[PDB]
Amino acid sequence: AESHRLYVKGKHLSYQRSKRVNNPNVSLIKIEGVATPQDAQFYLGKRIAYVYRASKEVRGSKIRVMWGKVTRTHGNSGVVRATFRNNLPAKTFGASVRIFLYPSNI
């Protein structure tokens, strides 16, 4: 109980985009340990959270969370696509993100 994590780590790389136009509506996530679209199929539909600090407390907390979910895979190397209730801020390209194991249809 050194470890308590029940999510897989991921990184927020980019919005969906062509060379010169981006689409903030979809985000591209690289899930740790996932190298192929075949592997990434496991994570589709799972929930993600981006988790951040703020100065103003809300429900007596300075931690905040943006939720979303993995929607399809992306390209040939396990990258995955994700939509969020809001839209990841963009300063967060490179930030860590958390990919849960539910909804589980193990």
């Binding site: 990184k11 790389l13 690289k30 740790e32 390209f93 490179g94 930030a95």
Partner: protein, 197 residues
């Protein structure tokens, strides 16, 4: 999958190392590259020196001080290859970069910290045998880098220290693998083997 990754520059091909190290920064991973002076470039030394001179001719004509800066140190020759592969003028660019350090030799904390290689940028895996190449240290020196010998001196001093260290290590790992031997074949050991351990 590590807070900081430390790469041994040795036997690595600049551009391919630069390519991987740059993607690493843009994805959030801190990198420090050491031993930048034993980095290679493919194709023999005369061509690479020649190239560096073509780069030397470029300066702002009216004020050479505002025109391109020609960095001669191996670490910094590498930093140039990298920088060109990152949108270094945007905010996100500067952030990516700030996650990265380059050194000639391997200066302390890193000296007692593990280093990794990057196979897809490793020359011996990459260059076809017979193909001529260039040591970055030798190249720098010839275009004005001052500290080849200083870093050489420091490295041998370091390497002596590292040997002693590695020798204690091995000796210790003897005692362990020895004194293990008894437990190594014990009922618990047979159980672990049943589950692959």
């Amino acid at each position: 999958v590590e807070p900081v990754v430390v790469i041994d520059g040795k036997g690595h091909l600049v551009g391919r190392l630069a390519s991987v190290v740059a993607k690493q920064l843009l994805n959030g991973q801190k990198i420090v590259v050491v031993r930048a002076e034993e980095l290679n470039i493919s194709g023999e030394f005369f061509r690479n020196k020649l190239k560096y001179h073509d780069f030397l001719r470029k300066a702002t004509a009216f004020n050479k001080t505002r025109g391109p800066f020609h960095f001669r140190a191996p670490s910094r020759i590498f930093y140039k290859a990298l920088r060109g592969m990152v949108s270094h003028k945007t905010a996100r660019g500067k952030a990516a970069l700030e996650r990265l350090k380059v050194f000639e030799g391997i200066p302390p904390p890193y000296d007692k910290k593990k280093r990794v290689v990057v196979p897809q940028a490793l020359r011996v895996l990459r260059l076809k045998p017979g193909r001529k190449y260039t040591t970055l240290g030798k190249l720098s020196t010839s275009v004005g880098w001052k500290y080849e010998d200083v870093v050489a001196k420091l490295e041998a001093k370091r390497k002596v220290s590292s040997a002693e260290y590695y020798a204690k290590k091995r000796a210790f790992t003897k005692k362990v693998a020895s004194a293990n031997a008894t437990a190594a074949e014990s009922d618990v050991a047979k159980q672990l083997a049943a589950l692959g351990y």
